[PDB]
Design a protein around this ligand. Structure first.
Ligand code: CHL
Ligand code: CLA
Ligand code: CLA
Ligand code: CLA
Ligand code: CLA
Ligand code: CLA
Ligand code: CLA
Ligand code: CLA
Ligand code: CLA
Ligand SMILES: CC(/C=C/C=C(C)/C=C/[C@@]12O[C@]1(C)C[C@@H](O)CC2(C)C)=C\C=C\C=C(C)\C=C\C=C(C)\C=C\[C@@]12O[C@]1(C)C[C@@H](O)CC2(C)C
Lengths: 314, 219, 42, 212, 65
């Protein structure tokens, strides 16, 4: 069996250990005899196997630390989406994505660094970025700074969510070693749920958002007078005019007549000649098939019921 | 003693001590050893009861404006489905005496006063009868169980003075509440799969049950 | 707040506060008096 | 008669059923245990924060008065073109920068005397001495005095001193929030506070913050 | 769907044959009233695998033949 196996309030939230530095060990929680103390403080800072010699406390520490790292990654993503919202030429790049340098950073005119704001194109003076985020946003069918702004607020929400989750899973209600040591469940969930349903939901986004908007942009359309994704979801006539395979519905799916779904889930190999990327129909079919694959793969290990495999048993 | 898909571990904490102990815990949510946060065998009981009660209000207040509206008894303007009332502005919106966000602030404030009190009664049950809440804290004190307070305000009538009738009523409560929760799930999924009200779905299935569920993902 | 003022008293937190204030000071001076190569005020 | 007796432990809290912190026993006025973060842990700093709350609230009370009463006079037809958030940009004498430094000089004297009271209570004593009479030693923030207690209401004449200080603090917390409402809804509506009140009272449903 | 067709027949037979192969066959708590094991988890497992085989065979038949 695979229980929940957590305990309440193992560590008291307080700034007392913020005050005394190097609290986490025996030879550092005394004070600096030298300046090597500082370096050994930062060096052994995340050496949780040196602080406490039990896998329970170590595992709680690394779990909440992963939550902090996820909060940082969500905060960084919020930053990139926001700098693409308010400090970018993303619209001008969508209008002409061959002569407009992708720029999503502007410098402040203080000590002559304003010349780093270059003629990237599109009535915009900024730094030409190279993260390819504009290309991701065209692959997602964004076409508006409002959408980048709201997903930046959402990524800030998720950063606060992950920070609260780390606080909760260390200080208020932390798992114990029986929760981490079970790995059949961890693999089953990270396969079927993280990577399986993750690819499934990305394929859903692409099937419902990226494919229509990118077909419109490839056909030639000003991104302002392009229909929003929720118009593709709700207005069935619109997405059906884009792909008539949608007109039949999911009875193609549930009757296993998928041959008629080959208008938007093609196996069209190679690159899209109009835009140089891959075929987003191919990518939607890809993420769908990968979702089926990881979903049947995440039901391989035995967790709580009779069916499955034991990794020890293998 | 009636067991609906009971397990070897589910018959270790769901013995008889809860209303509706049919032993159905295959996943193993309400296991008392190693608990914390909101996955607790007491908090999960409270959550079952509260989501069931709110789901009973939802079920007999979401099809009620259509149980009546297709039989008269109300204007057709105030006879919308559960989702064309402003709760899904993409799908529909009614104009009340306030905009929907003022009504959300209303819901938030009034339910905050209604449920932060409930929460602090969950934490220390003796409270909610010690602070001057306009004198109506006299009835908000008596808790016993956290989910079954039973005071002058919530239980004016007896309806379960004896423990046999109270146990049978608690069982009826949780069973009608589970039925209402499944009903709300049916409401959500039916409005998602058809885009019409639940009473329209019932009338379409009853009259000429053709394409009852064959319309998979089609509005 | 007790023991937060001790943390903010620590050398890196205090150094980042001091150098953020100082850097903002220098930055706003260079906004006010940009491109300076002499001290002509005597 | 004049002792500043505190509130009991079974006092009304900001959050009923919650545990008040141990550093808010009730010695201060308006003690309802409000400390989700616990910024008043150190009592030597909680004294400074109590003085901070008191002076902040007194200034906010005088300010909300100087905003709403003169607007009532403008509605009555006494003052012309009144708008508090444009009453600094409008014209006076002394350019609004000579006024600022004269203000800083005079308020520096006043608030410096108050600071010297805070650091060391008996330094800047007022209410001059009289033969064979003892002026009572006051508390910080409540100097009493011939200048600030000329009606002798601070030592507990009409009501006890604790309930009067609690009246000051509660009325003034309400005024602090009123001034925050002034500073926010005069910029997200670009209008008058009393105008906003009458506009919401016209239709409370749709004339709320979500219209703008 | 369209009960009686090939797409229904060679899917129903795959699902039922996998349920049989798990029940009385070589394939494999939660105390059910079934005589010999085959819990709800095993039932869902055999149904999932039989649906896998059914999708595979109906689409191999739709590709050719
Ligand atoms: C200092 C600020 C202060 C804060 C943050 C709170 C916070 C709260 N008090 Mg409150 N109080 C506060 C001052 C005081 N309270 C009280 C006495 C009470 C009582 C008696 C009760 C509360 C309750 C509440 C809740 C009501 C909020 C709500 O319904 O949704 C707010 C809705 C929005 C913010 C809309 C958002 C969209 C909330 C937890 C109630 C509760 O706990 O339930 C309750 O019964 N308070 C007193 C008198 C001693 C105060 C003195 O200043
Ligand atoms: C999943 C990734 C991962 C994780 C979880 C860990 C976790 C850990 N590592 Mg491992 N490590 C990783 C990746 C990872 N590492 C990689 C990619 C390398 C190759 C470089 C190493 C190489 C490595 C060595 C060689 C050692 C560790 C050690 C450790 C432990 C303590 C680290 C510590 O306290 O430093 C806390 C953090 C710091 C001291 C900060 C490091 C500063 C970096 C190096 C500067 C670079 C920053 C930036 C890019 C430069 C610009 C900065 C700007 C301000 C100018 C901890 C168990 C140590 C250990 O267990 O020894 C007992 C150890 O000796 N790691
Ligand atoms: C404000 C809320 C709060 C408070 C008061 C505490 C208090 C405490 N925590 Mg908890 N914690 C919190 C939030 C909080 N935590 C959150 C949100 C997380 C999830 C990440 C954790 C995860 C956590 C773990 C895993 C552990 C603690 C531990 C501790 C204790 C030691 C703290 C210490 O010395 O480190 C103070 C350290 C800092 C202030 C550094 C902050 C580092 C942040 C997270 C990352 C910032 C990185 C930055 C972006 C990159 C560098 C940029 C730079 C180069 C410019 C103490 C009781 C330890 C403990 O009790 O075990 C013995 C322990 O092992 N905490
Ligand atoms: C199907 C459920 C599921 C899902 C989706 C995940 C997903 C994840 N787990 Mg795993 N995990 C699961 C079940 C699941 N887990 C189970 C059952 C166990 C116990 C065996 C664990 C034990 C476990 C450990 C020990 C660790 C993880 C970690 C992670 C994260 C890896 C980072 C990553 O890929 O970022 C991709 C990022 C995202 C997809 C964004 C996440 C946003 C949502 C809100 C959270 C995902 C759902 C989550 C399970 C919470 C459910 C609701 C909650 C209120 C209860 C990732 C978010 C590691 C980590 O990062 O630490 C935090 C880590 O250290 N998990
Ligand atoms: C719990 C709950 C909640 C949140 C709602 C919420 C709502 N109901 Mg429902 N209702 C409930 C229980 C509930 N009801 C029950 C128990 C009955 C019986 C009804 C019978 C009912 C009718 C007959 C109507 C509403 C209507 C409404 C709406 C307007 C409410 C109003 O004007 O004030 C709103 C969406 C009205 C609407 O559709 O708008 C309307 O005509 N309700
Ligand atoms: C060590 C070598 C060195 C030297 C000598 C200089 C010198 C200078 N640099 Mg260069 N620079 C250097 C290294 C150096 N830099 C490096 C390493 C970099 C890369 C990081 C740069 C990057 C750089 C840029 C990008 C810029 C400069 C600029 C400047 C000028 C500064 C003007 C300014 O803001 O000061 C004004 C004075 C101050 C900020 C000091 C104010 C101090 C406070 C207010 C206290 C003073 C009052 C005090 C109370 C006493 C009063 C007396 C009494 C009444 C009590 C000056 C000619 C700027 C410039 O104008 O270009 C020429 C400019 O734009 N430098
Ligand atoms: C100048 C502001 C100020 C200050 C310094 C204090 C100080 C104090 N208050 Mg008072 N209080 C204030 C304003 C203030 N209050 C207002 C406006 C209210 C009504 C909302 C209250 C209501 C209140 C109650 C009900 C109680 C106290 C109590 C206390 C004491 C403990 C808390 C503490 O140390 O916080 C120190 C606080 C600060 C240093 C200020 C916070 C500054 C940070 C940066 C946050 C500011 C952002 C803020 C959240 C913005 C508002 C957003 C808006 C949407 C609402 C202390 C004497 C308790 C007590 O014993 O009474 C004497 C008590 O029971 N206060
Ligand atoms: C070097 C000479 C000097 C200096 C710099 C000061 C400076 C100050 N005095 Mg002091 N003072 C001085 C000589 C001086 N005094 C002398 C010679 C006397 C006569 C004994 C006084 C008697 C005095 C009193 C009685 C008071 C001050 C006060 C003040 C403050 C006025 C606040 C402000 O800026 O208002 C513009 C300021 C700190 C006031 C204050 O705030 O005290 C803390 C106050 O009440 N001073
Ligand atoms: C309405 C809010 C209010 C209330 C109830 C109090 C109450 C009190 N104050 Mg505070 N005070 C306030 C506002 C308030 N003050 C403001 C806005 C200021 C700034 C000017 C002060 C400045 C102040 C000082 C400097 C002193 C007091 C003192 C006192 C005490 C005696 C006077 C009295 O009862 O006032 C009754 C108030 C009214 C009837 C309000 C109407 C007045 C109209 C507008 C004229 C008592 C605790 C004294 C004290 O505690 O001595 C020991 C003391 O020394 N207060
Ligand atoms: C609270 C709730 C609903 C509340 C609804 C309300 C207030 C509705 C209000 C409205 O309608 C009206 C009145 C009028 C409309 O105009 C407006 C709205 C606003 C729309 C639903 C909960 C709904 C909750 C649901 C559906 C939960 C289902 C849970 C299931 C099936 C769990 C199963 C298991 O947990 C067990 C039993 C054992 C485990 O071991 C195994 C598994 C299998 C995991």
């Amino acid at each position: 069996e695979v229980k929940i196996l957590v305990d309440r309030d193992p560590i008291k939230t307080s700034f007392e250990e913020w005050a005394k530095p190097g609290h986490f060990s025996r030879t550092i929680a005394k004070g600096p005899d030298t300046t090597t103390w500082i370096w050994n403080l930062h060096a052994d800072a995340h050496d949780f196997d040196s602080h406490t010699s039990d896998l329970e406390e170590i595992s709680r520490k690394v779990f909440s630390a992963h939550f902090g790292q996820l909060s940082i990654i969500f905060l960084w993503l919020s930053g990139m989406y926001f700098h693409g919202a308010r400090f970018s030429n993303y619209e001008a790049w969508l209008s002409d994505p061959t002569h407009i340098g992708p720029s999503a950073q502007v410098v402040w005119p203080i000590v002559g660094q304003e010349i780093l704001n270059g003629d990237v194109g599109g009535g915009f003076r900024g730094i030409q970025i190279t993260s390819g985020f504009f290309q991701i946003w065209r692959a997602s069918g964004i076409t508006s700074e409002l959408q980048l702004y709201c997903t930046a607020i959402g990524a800030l929400v998720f950063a606060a969510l992950m920070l609260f989750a780390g606080w909760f899973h260390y200080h208020k209600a932390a798992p114990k070693l029986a929760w981490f040591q079970d790995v059949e469940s961890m693999l089953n969930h990270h396969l079927a749920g993280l990577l399986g349903l993750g690819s499934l939901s990305w394929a859903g986004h692409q099937v419902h958002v990226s494919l229509p908007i990118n077909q419109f942009l490839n056909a030639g359309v000003d991104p302002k007078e392009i229909p929003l994704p929720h118009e593709f979801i709700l207005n069935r006539d619109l997405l059906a005019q884009l792909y008539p395979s949608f007109a039949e519905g999911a009875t193609p799916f549930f009757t296993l007549n998928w041959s008629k779904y080959s208008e938007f889930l093609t196996f069209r190999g190679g690159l899209d000649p109009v835009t140089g990327g891959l075929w987003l129909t191919d990518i939607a079919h890809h993420h769908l098939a990968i979702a089926i694959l990881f979903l049947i793969a995440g039901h391989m290990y035995r967790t709580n019921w009779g069916i499955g495999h034991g990794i020890k048993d293998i | 003693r009636p067991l609906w898909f009971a397990s070897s571990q589910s018959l270790s904490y769901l013995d008889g001590s809860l209303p509706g102990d049919y032993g159905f815990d295959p996943l193993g949510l309400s296991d008392p050893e190693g608990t914390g946060g909101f996955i607790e065998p007491r908090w999960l009981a409270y959550g079952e009861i509260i989501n069931g009660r709110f789901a009973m209000l939802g079920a007999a207040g979401a099809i009620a404006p259509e149980i009546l509206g297709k039989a008269g008894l109300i204007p057709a303007e105030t006879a919308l489905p559960w989702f064309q009332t402003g709760v899904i502005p993409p799908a529909g919106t009614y104009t009340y005496w306030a905009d929907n966000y003022t009504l959300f602030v209303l819901e938030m404030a009034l339910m905050g006063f209604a449920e932060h009190r409930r929460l602090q009664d969950w934490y220390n049950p003796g409270s909610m009868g010690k602070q001057y809440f306009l004198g109506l804290e006299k009835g908000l004190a008596g808790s016993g169980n956290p989910a079954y307070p039973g005071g002058p305000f919530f239980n004016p009538l007896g309806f379960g003075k004896d423990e046999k009738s109270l146990k049978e009523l608690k069982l009826k409560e949780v069973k009608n509440g589970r039925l209402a929760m499944l009903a709300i799930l049916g409401y959500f999924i039916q409005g998602l799969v058809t885009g019409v009200g639940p009473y329209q779905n019932l009338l379409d299935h009853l009259a000429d049950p053709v394409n009852n569920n064959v319309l998979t993902s089609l509005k | 707040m007790r023991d937060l003022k001790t943390y903010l008293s620590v050398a890196p937190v205090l150094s980042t506060l001091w150098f953020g204030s100082l850097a903002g000071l220098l930055i706003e001076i260079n906004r006010l008096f940009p491109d300076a190569l002499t001290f002509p005020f005597f | 008669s004049s002792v500043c007796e505190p509130l009991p432990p079974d006092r009304p809290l900001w959050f009923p059923g919650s545990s008040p912190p141990e550093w808010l026993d009730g010695s201060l006025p308006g003690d309802f245990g409000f400390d989700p973060l616990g910024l008043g842990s150190d009592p030597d700093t909680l004294k400074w924060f109590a003085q901070a709350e008191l002076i902040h609230s007194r200034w906010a009370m005088l300010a909300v008065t100087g905003i709403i009463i003169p607007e009532c006079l403008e509605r009555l037809g006494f003052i012309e073109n009144f708008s508090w958030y444009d009453a600094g940009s409008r014209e006076y004498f002394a350019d609004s920068t000579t006024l600022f430094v004269a203000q800083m000089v005079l308020m520096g004297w006043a608030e410096g005397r108050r600071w010297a009271d805070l650091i060391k209570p008996g330094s800047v004593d007022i209410e001059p001495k009289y033969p064979h009479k003892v002026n009572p030693k006051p508390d910080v923030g409540y100097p009493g005095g011939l200048w600030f207690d000329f009606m002798m209401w601070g030592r507990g004449s009409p009501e006890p001193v604790m309930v009067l200080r609690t009246k000051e603090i509660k009325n003034g917390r309400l005024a602090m929030l009123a001034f925050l409402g002034f500073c926010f809804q005069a910029t997200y509506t670009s209008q008058d506070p009393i105008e906003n009140l009458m506009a919401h009272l016209a239709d409370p449903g749709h004339c709320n913050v979500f219209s703008a | 769907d369209f009960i009686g067709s090939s797409t229904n027949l060679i899917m129903v037979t795959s699902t039922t044959l996998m349920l049989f192969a798990g029940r009385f066959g070589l394939a494999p708590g939660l105390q059910t009233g079934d005589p010999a094991g085959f819990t709800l988890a095993d039932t869902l497992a055999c149904g999932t695998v039989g649906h896998i085989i059914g999708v595979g065979v109906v689409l191999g038949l739709k590709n050719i033949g």
